[PDB]
Design an enzyme around this catalytic site. Structure first.
Site, mmCIF file in Angstrom:
data_model
loop_
_atom_site.group_PDB
_atom_site.id
_atom_site.type_symbol
_atom_site.label_atom_id
_atom_site.label_comp_id
_atom_site.label_asym_id
_atom_site.label_seq_id
_atom_site.Cartn_x
_atom_site.Cartn_y
_atom_site.Cartn_z
ATOM 1 C CD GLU A 31 -2.951 1.123 0.092
ATOM 2 O OE1 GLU A 31 -3.989 0.370 0.116
ATOM 3 O OE2 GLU A 31 -2.658 1.813 -0.914
ATOM 4 C CG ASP A 38 -3.749 -3.086 2.358
ATOM 5 O OD1 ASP A 38 -3.638 -2.221 1.455
ATOM 6 O OD2 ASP A 38 -4.794 -3.395 2.947
#
Ligand SMILES: [Mn+2]
Ligand SMILES: [Mn+2]
Length: 181
Positions: free
Chosen positions: A65, A93
């Site tokens: 992310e 992420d």
């Protein structure tokens, strides 16, 4: 009483580098932070939780992310090639080098179990681990496996509580809570 602006709040209460990554994400999506400002705060919050999660155990996680989309896929593909991990269909992420899996982190103002179920239904992978946090201390994770220890997760929950409290003191909490779709 005074109702502040969510932009003032975000720029005053998040690290300048988190703010800058959130600006880039929004630009990447063709979203205008000046109009979708609750979303801007949500994006900053989610970035910050991703960083705290990774920082809870130095070198254990690769951060996905925050990166530009193209670079993010370059990193996901390198990890898959190096580790043999199965390639995910949506950008996750983090990647956890200890447990050998990608992680999707979710942060929600809605009920955690419903949000968990929605997230699981969306990515539809048997391999990506999901970990959801809410603003009021609840969490839910894939197979009841919470990855980090209690103190690490507590630090994240306390940060979320602090954001909620500071929003509410400025009159921003109600609209921020209700705006999540
Ligand atoms: Mn993400
Ligand atoms: Mn996420």
């Amino acid at each position: 009483g005074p109702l502040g602006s969510m932009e003032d709040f975000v720029r005053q209460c998040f690290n300048p580098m988190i703010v800058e990554l959130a600006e880039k994400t929004m630009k990447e999506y063709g979203e205008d932070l000046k109009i979708e400002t609750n979303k801007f705060a949500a994006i900053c919050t989610h970035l910050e939780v991703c960083f705290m999660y990774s920082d809870a155990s130095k070198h254990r996680f690769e951060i996905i992310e925050g990166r530009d989309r193209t670079m993010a896929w370059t990193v996901v593909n390198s990890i898959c090639n190096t580790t043999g991990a199965e390639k995910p269909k949506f950008l996750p992420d983090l990647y956890d080098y200890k447990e050998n899996r990608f992680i999707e982190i979710g942060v929600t103002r809605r009920e955690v179990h419903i949000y968990y179920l929605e997230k699981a239904n969306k990515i539809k992978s048997e391999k990506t681990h999901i970990h959801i946090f809410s603003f009021t201390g609840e969490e839910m994770a894939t197979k009841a496996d919470y990855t980090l220890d209690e103190e690490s997760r507590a630090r994240i929950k306390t940060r979320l509580f602090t954001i909620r409290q500071e929003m509410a003191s400025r009159g921003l909490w109600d609209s921020f809570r209700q705006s999540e779709r």
